Design a protein around this nucleic acid. Structure first.
Lengths: 756, 524, 575
RNA sequence: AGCAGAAGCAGA
């Protein structure tokens, strides 16, 4: 008797039992080595689909540019980037008279948003390419480096506060002849070693000053740093993604807020909604298209997907979209929106780290950088790498970068690209023929609903749609997509069967340990179970199991097994003594080797609150000690929100709410100088918070200096503390004298002027 | 007093020339940037990193202080913390055991007031303990994907208002502006003040825990039956796709409390104000000096984003947003496409009388709701081109079809009028043409369906047609369709400012009206 | 605007004030001002004029030379400058353009629609049926169905791993004392002496009085873990002038055919036994009615999985990767020895301890995530490797002794192998318990749907059968060309095994396969319900799937099951 | 050797 798992689908339908098809217990593929090979591949692929158009040289950057827009219409089913401006404009003109007043209103609100939006809004964008150091930094850093850097060139923009004058300086910084900036350089210092050679390169970095020419800076500003995508699911081969510079971000958010303010008032958009709000708004829209099915006629759905979506689009199309969308708005805002496409139109692509060569005989390896990539005979590369480097030649630049006019680099204008895909759906009908189409669009993934008298005519409607998409620079996937009569389909990896079915395996990775800290991960793990009970169709028995499977792994992750068990370990030895000392054992936390009180009924409540009354008075005083040493300085974002792929959880400020070392770093890089840089800002902020108690909660506003304020505040504190009777005349005149100095210190220009 | 100690530390920072130029150059604005500044790399896969580091020797980082030094170096052959001082902080690190030791052998802390600080969480446990659990019932439940409040509040407010409350509680000097509709929670402020006094827990936490019990957490969920927070919190246990569960909570009555009263209060202000002349001027002078419990009605209508119709009418009269939606008696409509010109014309109707009606011209589409049934409308100039609905209550499925046929202004509707239609309201005033036609066709439904006619049903898997009796059929009414698929809730997130007429009708900025006085519910 | 030239005196209408400390304005005057200001603020708000007032305290953006010229070159083809595109887009009328552009486009640009029929759907991946290729080998981390656990009764509480390995080897002394074996089967590039001299050093270091489980840094161990095999980092300037240095042609996964052992694995892992392996900890008291039902359901669901063989295999992988990840960080540069542990309980409720073999840890200076630790696996097994010769090319097998299983003898085989893993797989190993949920959620949904119809808990009815309803029967598999019926609990164990097999052979081939095959599955679902499905490029779908199949066993066996499932649906479709 | 899979790790 032989077993077969696919035979399950005879008794059960596939959509209701789709959870089994996703192997999300298993290991996803990670990035081995460099991503230069894939980066070059995409650089070619992008130019391959646009090579028929006009080639020309940029007089500013001095690079190889390609322009397929208003190019020759293709005569083949291979991918095309050869869009037609005329068509895109008509599609928008069709869309405007369908939703009259939308285009100008979205431009109004996005503008009246911009007028208030401050520089610090840029801080929340995770990864960012820091031009000053040619490395990926975290947003707020790349911002602050650029702010300080700009001040050297006499570009005091961020001081005013608003994003407008900061972005004014960004486009003014491209006019500068010589760009001075703060930068990091390593120092190759030697040390003794007992390893083969007898020495060791301990790389120490420090803060220095570097200069750059106008042209070199523009190239760095227009750059995008590439890498390989880790843990990409549902795909065999690895693909390379990119990251954006800090300059362009300011202009992007304005256009994405505009394209958002369009997509909000569109029924066919699957954006910007998320969670159940999506599931709801979709099921609504599915009905809105089903209803268009005429009398005595068939309704069909195409399971849509686009290949080479980010590669076949073009900034020049998006540039027209803004100039169309903004029609009625004033000039400065129209100029503002036009920038974000332009900087992608003239963008430059970094080529990662580079390839590596070896010799099996002598057992030696060596890294080959991007600048010195061609300084070598081409025969010495392998067969597939040779062909890549051959086609890279003309687009390649001599300082280790590739020019790249077409393409949008693996996602960035996600909203406005949906608007373009929606504008394709906004046509509906061609030639007054016997069909109608509409659909759902969400970035590259779409879903077309075609209605007609019979299904033979539906295919001619699909054929026309496929052909209309080619005119807008959109490539429907013949290889992957398919179609059928209405009933079931796929869309954003959410399946349909007389309603959107629940799918559990998708969310399976989140059930495990989060990786923040003991106290938090606990409440997170249960909140995941709570959400998945409601949203993703998990029953009580599976939920109760999921409780056990979390606590089980939780104990092995954090090494906090039951107090009445003999699992020998370092922490576990102390747990056993705590188990014996305490009388109220049922009140202990799991992190302190306690029992798991959690069950379906009490998931929403936090662990510490459930057990508080059952604790001992001496145990809770330590567990919940106010000035305990493991927390540190708190922020409102740290307690509330957490990272999953963001969401917000609920927990108490316990001793188990602790933080990590500052993730190691790569190599014996002794980052002493740079750690002082971090503390220097911290201490200032920590002193700032003491002067201004709010700070953490209420983001304070002021164009004046931090010191200048702290002086004026600490003055008045003493003024009040003398009158109310907290400080004496001696302590008051102390302060007024001490502060007096601080004033003279804070209005100098160089030394601290010590005295004898 | 701390005051002086700050100044000394500031002077000691101005000795270091790097920190001097930070405080000199960096702005109060930029504070929010430099606080997030770090070196490091944000490492992918933190769950992988946690399991790895937890197995290592000293993964934790420790804050320096007098309390840090009370942790010893070793304990029975176990390394708790490490000496190796980093040159920057002169600081330290520690291991997983260091925390466990602290909870075992560490010092006692003043945990007084802890219950009152995290009160919002403790009220959840109060609800679970005292709650009695009813019977379980296995049966298929149709779950409406509604917008709902996730967590119950002490007092609902918007973020803008609640912040200035939180400020006057914890940071009374820095609060600044004395706002109008903010302080009047002086009962709540003075109450929170005295409760959160003796505790010495970090302010940033107190503020967050106030915000959790003063700010609305409203998300979309699959819901059926009760729509109250103290239920919703337990929703995971109360119901699933294919089962149900009864539940009765701690039972102190919240959320619904104000929502229910605010409805009635507004409705009753209307009924009195309609009669006498200049209803607006009375509706204002009344609602100004009305009260719910302690709050004036202004702050309740503004803070709570619920209401029915009367709420939004009273809102508009006083002067706040209401919601971008359109109502016609019992019918609700949200514009999804198109725009029309209400244009005056002389109209003959079926019975043989000339009524002066305004005619909606142009192609349009609408997301529409009535009671338990929801659907989608498409109309044009005096023509209902298409209508869709979902399987629900037959009383409301009928009303929806009727009310759509009314506002569609279909010629087949106008021709189906028989007899006189002189209807009046409560005050004894003539209803305007279309509000008249509404009540006629709701009453005499059968006269319309015969005049309408029938056509073929659309042959799409999950659709079927209907007839006069509201039953399944291969024939269908010209335009109307029914679907098996379940539809989204009402859904009206965005908000808009509105003006008001003498007769308590609400005018959108364009020129049309959305919420009429006549559209309220009589149910008391 | 004043720096510090004058003393400022700020007064506000709404009762705020800012003054200097050295200033000589008393509380008296401050009042006069602030009172008068508010007195006017009230008289303004009374007669409605407070928002009109403009107080004492109460957009420009243009482009530069560089960015303008960048924009001017960022236009579509044909245009001269940006001002042209702007004024073109704003003032021209594009109506009727799409229709003209569609007309002059070539008809070769089409979707090529073809209606989907059954005879179009040929079997996927024809090369797996061909006998000329070598059959797919056993490339998993540990043994699954071929395992053999050495038993031991214990008091029933946790204990150190070295003490456990010692007591297990103490009982079976016939096997522990073997210093004179017989060689069975060999790998291609392995070494018998070094592998055996390791094993002996493992047994010696485990069975002694000492605490330290560190293995000595021996020359036979240096080869087995891979000492000094890394390529040295020379500088780029030297490599350029060197001619023999090249980029190596990277290895492609070797193409393999179907193997019968994967079928047997699926069969034996799904089969029931008397043992129970799971270590699920306690939960709180069941107060609510739902919690009683969940706990009632768990008793059937959980134990039906727990009894099965896959559950015993799972917990072996978990507790091994749990301890392996710990040792990799605490002792980075030390050759250590780790046992293969798993705790067990049988029907009567008695505590056993299992030992499936040993494992030698290599040098684990792990900085990056992909970095590879090298583990050497020594595992016990009843199976004879000469039965299926193509199954064990990677493994080196020994014959150590015999054991009384119950009545007759059974031959003991020690399976040696040089292996590897990374921090990623070790993490996913610890979190491999969730296979329970993926399978259990699917079957619990079937129960809830059934209970919705009739109106009471159908858990008992589906498993065993009760008064009215018969037992729920799923089509579980095939028997030499015909359909076979199986119970509800068997279907749970089937999916749970499948879920576990996703982790065992989880790599790029699986992810890419299951994604593209899922599309073809949905097309088969459309044919079953009769929805007139259409396809555009059928060979495009197949070409996407076929390249995923190479040397992953579960992929190749899933491809065989898919084609057999497709064939038996064709017969079922005609009726 | 081996993990692995279009390029790396097998201490720097």
């Amino acid at each position: 008797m032989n077993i077969n798992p696919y035979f399950l689908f005879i008794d059960v339908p596939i959509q209701a039992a789709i959870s089994t098809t996703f192997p999300y217990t298993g290991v996803p593929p990670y990035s081995h080595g460099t991503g230069t090979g894939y980066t070059i591949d995409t650089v070619i692929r992008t130019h391959e689909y646009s090579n028929k158009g006009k080639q020309y040289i940029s007089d500013v950057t001095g690079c190889t540019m390609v322009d397929p827009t208003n190019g020759p219409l293709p005569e083949d089913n291979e991918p095309s980037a050869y869009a037609q401006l005329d068509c895109v404009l008509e599609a928008l003109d069709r869309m405007d008279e369908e939703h009259p007043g939308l285009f100008q209103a979205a431009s109004q609100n996005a503008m009246e948003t911009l007028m208030v939006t401050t520089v610090d809004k840029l801080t929340q964008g995770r990864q960012t390419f820091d031009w000053t150091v040619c490395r990926n930094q975290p947003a707020a850093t790349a911002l602050n480096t650029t702010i300080t850097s700009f001040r050297l060139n006499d570009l005091n923009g961020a001081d005013k506060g608003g994003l407008i004058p900061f972005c004014q300086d960004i486009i003014d910084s491209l006019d500068r002849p010589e760009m001075t900036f703060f930068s990091v350089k390593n120092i190759k210092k030697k040390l003794p070693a007992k390893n083969r050679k007898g020495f060791l390169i301990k790389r120490i970095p420090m803060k220095v000053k570097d200069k750059i020419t106008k042209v070199e800076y523009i190239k760095r500003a227009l750059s995008l740093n590439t890498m390989t995508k880790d843990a990409e699911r549902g795909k065999l081969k690895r693909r390379a993604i990119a990251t954006a510079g800090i300059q362009i971000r300011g202009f992007v958010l304005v256009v994405e807020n505009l394209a958002k303010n369009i997509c909000e008032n569109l029924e066919q958009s699957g954006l910007p909604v998320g969670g159940n709000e999506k599931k709801a708004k979709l099921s609504n829209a599915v009905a809105k298209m089903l209803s268009n099915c005429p009398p005595g006629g068939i309704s069909m759905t195409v399971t849509g997907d686009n290949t080479k979506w980010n590669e076949c689009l073009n900034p020049r199309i998006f540039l027209a979209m803004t100039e169309r969308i903004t029609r009625d708005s004033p000039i400065w805002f129209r100029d503002f929106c036009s920038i974000a496409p332009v900087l992608f139109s003239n963008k430059i692509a970094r080529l990662g780290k580079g390839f590596m060569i070896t010799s099996k005989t002598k057992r030696l390896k060596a890294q080959i950088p991007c600048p010195d990539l061609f300084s070598i005979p081409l025969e010495r590369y392998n067969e597939e790498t040779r062909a890549k480097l051959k086609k890279l030649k003309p687009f390649f630049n001599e300082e280790g970068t590739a020019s790249l006019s077409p393409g949008m680099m693996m996602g960035m204008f996600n909203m406005l690209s949906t608007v373009l895909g929606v504008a394709a759906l906004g046509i509906k009908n061609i030639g007054n023929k016997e069909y109608l189409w509409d659909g759902l669009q969400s970035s590259d993934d779409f879903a077309l609903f075609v209605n007609a008298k019979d299904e033979e005519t539906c295919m001619e409607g699909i054929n026309d749609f496929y052909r209309t998409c080619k005119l807008l620079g959109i490539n429907m996937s013949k290889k992957k997509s398919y179609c059928n009569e209405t009933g079931m389909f796929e869309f954003t990896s959410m399946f349909y069967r007389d309603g959107f079915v629940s799918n559990f395996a998708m969310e399976l990775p989140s059930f495990g340990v989060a990786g923040v800290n003991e106290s938090a991960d606990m409440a997170i793990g249960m909140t995941i179970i709570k959400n998945n009970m409601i949203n993703n169709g998990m029953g009580p028995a599976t939920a109760q199991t999921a409780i056990q499977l979390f606590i089980a792994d939780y104990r092995y992750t954090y090494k906090c097994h039951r107090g009445d068990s003999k699992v020998e370990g370092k922490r576990m030895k102390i747990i056993k003594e705590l188990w014996e000392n305490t009388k109220g054992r049922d009140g202990l936390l799991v992190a302190d080797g306690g029992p798991n009180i959690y069950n379906l009924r009490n998931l929403h409540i936090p662990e510490i609150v459930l057990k508080y009354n059952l604790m001992d008075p001496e145990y809770k005083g330590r567990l919940l000690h106010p000035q305990n040493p493991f927390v540190g300085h708190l922020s409102i974002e740290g307690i509330k929100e957490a990272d999953i792929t963001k969401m917000d959880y609920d927990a108490v400020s316990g001793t188990h709410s602790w933080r990590t070392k500052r993730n190691r770093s790569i190599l014996n890089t002794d980052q002493r100088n740079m750690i002082l840089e971090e503390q220097c800002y911290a201490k200032c902020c920590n002193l700032f918070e003491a002067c201004f108690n709010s700070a953490s909660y209420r983001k304070p506003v002021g164009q004046h200096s931090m010191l200048e304020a702290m002086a004026h505040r600490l003055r008045m504190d003493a003024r009040l503390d003398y009158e109310s009777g907290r400080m004496s005349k001696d302590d008051f005149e102390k302060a007024m004298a001490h502060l007096g100095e601080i004033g003279y210190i804070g209005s100098g220009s160089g030394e601290n002027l010590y005295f004898q | 007093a701390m005051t002086l100690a700050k100044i000394e530390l500031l002077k000691q920072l101005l000795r270091d020339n790097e920190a001097k130029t930070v405080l000199k150059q960096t702005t109060v604005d930029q504070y929010n940037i430099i606080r997030k500044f770090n070196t490091s790399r944000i490492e992918k896969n933190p769950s992988l990193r946690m399991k790895w580091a937890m197995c290592s020797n000293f993964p934790l980082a420790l804050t320096k202080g007098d309390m840090a030094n009370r942790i010893p170096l070793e304990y029975k052959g176990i390394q708790l913390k490490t000496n190796a001082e980093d040159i920057g902080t002169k600081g330290q690190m520690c291991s997983i055991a260091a925390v466990t030791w602290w909870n075992t052998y560490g010092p006692i802390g003043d945990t007084e007031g802890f219950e009152r600080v995290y009160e919002s969480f403790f009220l959840r446990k109060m609800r679970l303990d005292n709650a009695t659990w009813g019977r379980i019932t296995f049966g298929p439940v149709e779950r409406v994907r509604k917008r709902v409040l996730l967590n119950p509040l002490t007092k609902e407010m918007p973020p803008d208002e609640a912040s200035n409350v939180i400020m006057e509680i914890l940071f009374p000097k820095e609060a600044g502006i004395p706002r109008e509709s903010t302080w009047i929670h002086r009962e709540l402020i003075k109450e929170k003040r005295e409760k959160l006094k003796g505790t010495m827990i970090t302010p940033i936490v107190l503020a967050y825990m106030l915000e959790r019990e003063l700010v609305a957490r409203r998300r979309f969920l699959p819901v059926a039956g009760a729509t109250s927070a103290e239920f919703i919190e337990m929703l995971h246990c109360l119901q699933g796709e294919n089962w149900r569960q009864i539940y009765h909570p701690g039972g102190n009555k919240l959320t619904e409390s104000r929502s229910q009263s605010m409805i009635v209060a507004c409705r009753k202000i209307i009924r009195r104000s309609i009669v006498a002349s200049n209803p607006l001027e009375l509706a204002v002078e009344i609602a100004n000096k009305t009260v719910i419990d302690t709050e004036p009605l202004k702050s309740c209508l503004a803070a709570i984003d619920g209401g029915d119709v009367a709420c939004d009418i009273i809102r508009a009269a006083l002067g706040l947003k209401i919601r971008q939606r359109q109502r016609f008696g019992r019918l609700e409509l949200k514009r999804i496409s198109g725009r029309g010109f209400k244009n005056d014309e002389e109209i003959l109707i079926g019975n043989g009388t000339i009524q002066k009606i305004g005619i909606w011209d142009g192609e349009e589409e609408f997301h529409v709701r009535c009671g338990e049934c929801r659907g989608i409308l498409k109309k044009s100039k005096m023509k209902l081109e298409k209508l869709l609905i979902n399987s629900a209550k037959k009383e409301d499925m009928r009303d929806l079809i009727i009310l759509c046929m009314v506002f569609s202004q279909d010629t087949r509707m106008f021709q189906g009028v028989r007899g006189e239609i002189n209807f009046l309201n409560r005050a004894g005033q003539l209803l305007s043409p279309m509000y008249q036609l509404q009540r006629y066709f709701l009453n005499r439904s059968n006269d319309l369906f015969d005049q309408w006619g029938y056509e073929e049903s659309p042959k799409a898997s999950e659709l079927h047609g209907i007839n006069e009796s509201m039953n399944a059929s291969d024939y269908t009414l010209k335009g109307v369709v029914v679907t098996r698929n379940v539809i989204d809730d009402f859904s009206s997130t965005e908000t808009e400012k509105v003006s008001i007429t003498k007769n308590l009708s609400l005018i959108k900025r364009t020129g049309e009206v959305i919420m009429g006085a006549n559209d309220v519910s009589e149910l008391e | 605007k004043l720096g510090n030239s004058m003393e400022l005196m700020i007064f506000s209408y709404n009762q705020d004030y800012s003054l200097s400390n050295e200033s000589s304005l008393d509380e008296e005057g401050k009042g006069r001002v602030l009172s008068r200001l508010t007195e006017l603020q009230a008289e303004l708000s009374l007669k409605n004029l407070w928002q009109v007032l403009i107080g004492e305290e109460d957009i420009d953006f243009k482009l530069g030379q560089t960015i303008s010229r960048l924009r001017d070159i960022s236009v579509p083809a044909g245009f001269s400058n940006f001002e042209g595109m702007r004024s073109y887009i704003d003032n021209i009328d594009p109506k009727g353009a799409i229709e003209r552009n569609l007309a002059r486009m070539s008809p070769l640009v089409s979707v090529t629609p073809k209606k989907l029929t059954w005879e179009d759907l040929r079997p996927i991946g024809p090369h797996i049926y061909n006998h000329e290729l070598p059959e797919v080998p056993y490339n998993a981390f540990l043994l699954m169905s071929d395992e053999l656990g050495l038993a031991n009764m214990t008091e029933g509480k946790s204990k150190k791993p070295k003490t456990l390995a010692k007591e297990c080897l103490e009982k079976y002394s016939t096997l522990r004392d073997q210093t004179d074996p017989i060689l069975i089967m060999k790998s291609e590039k392995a070494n018998e002496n070094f592998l055996w001299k390791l094993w002996r050093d493992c047994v010696n270091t485990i069975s002694n009085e000492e605490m330290s489980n560190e293995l000595q840094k021996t020359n036979y161990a240096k080869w087995a873990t891979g000492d000094g095999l890394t390529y040295q980092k020379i500088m780029k300037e030297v490599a350029i002038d060197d001619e023999t240095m090249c980029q190596e042609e990277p290895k492609i996964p070797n193409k393999c055919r179907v193997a019968a052992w994967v079928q047997t694995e699926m069969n034996l892992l799904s089969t029931l036994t008397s043992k129970r392996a799971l270590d699920l900890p306690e939960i709180g008291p069941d107060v609510a009615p739902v919690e009683h039902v969940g706990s009632e359901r768990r008793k059937y669901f959980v134990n039906e999985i727990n009894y099965c063989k896959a559950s015993t295999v799972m917990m072996k992988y978990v507790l091994f990767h749990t301890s392996l990840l710990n040792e990799s960080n605490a002792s980075m540069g030390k050759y250590k020895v780790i046992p293969i542990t798993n705790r067990v309980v049988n029907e009567k409720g008695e505590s056993f301890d299992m030992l499936y073999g040993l494992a030698v840890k290599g040098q684990s200076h792990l900085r990056g995530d992909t970095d590879v630790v090298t583990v050497v696996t020594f595992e016990f097994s009843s199976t004879d490797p000469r039965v299926d010769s193509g199954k064990w090319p990677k493994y080196t097998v020994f014959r150590i002794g015999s054991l009384f299983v119950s009545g007759r003898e059974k031959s003991v085989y020690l399976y040696c192998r040089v292996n590897g893993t990374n921090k990623i797989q070790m993490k996913w190993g610890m979190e491999a318990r969730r296979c329970l949920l993926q399978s259990m959620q699917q079957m619990e949904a079937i129960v809830e749907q059934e209970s919705s119809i009739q109106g009471y808990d159908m858990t008992k009815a589906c498993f065993k059968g009760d008064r009215v309803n018969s037992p729920k029967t799923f089509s579980i598999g095939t028997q030499e060309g015909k359909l076979v019926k199986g119970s509800f609990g068997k279907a749970l164990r089937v999916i749970f095994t499948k879920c576990l097999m996703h982790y065992v052979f989880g790599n790029a081939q699986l992810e890419g396969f299951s994604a593209e095959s899922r599309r073809l599955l949905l097309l088969i679902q459309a044919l079953k319900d009769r929805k007139g499905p259409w396809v555009f490029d059928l060979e495009g779908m197949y070409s996407g799937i076929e390249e995923c199949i190479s040397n992953n066993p579960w992929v190749i066996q899933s491809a065989y099951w898919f084609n057999e499932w497709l064939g038996f649906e064709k017969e079922g479709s005609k009726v």
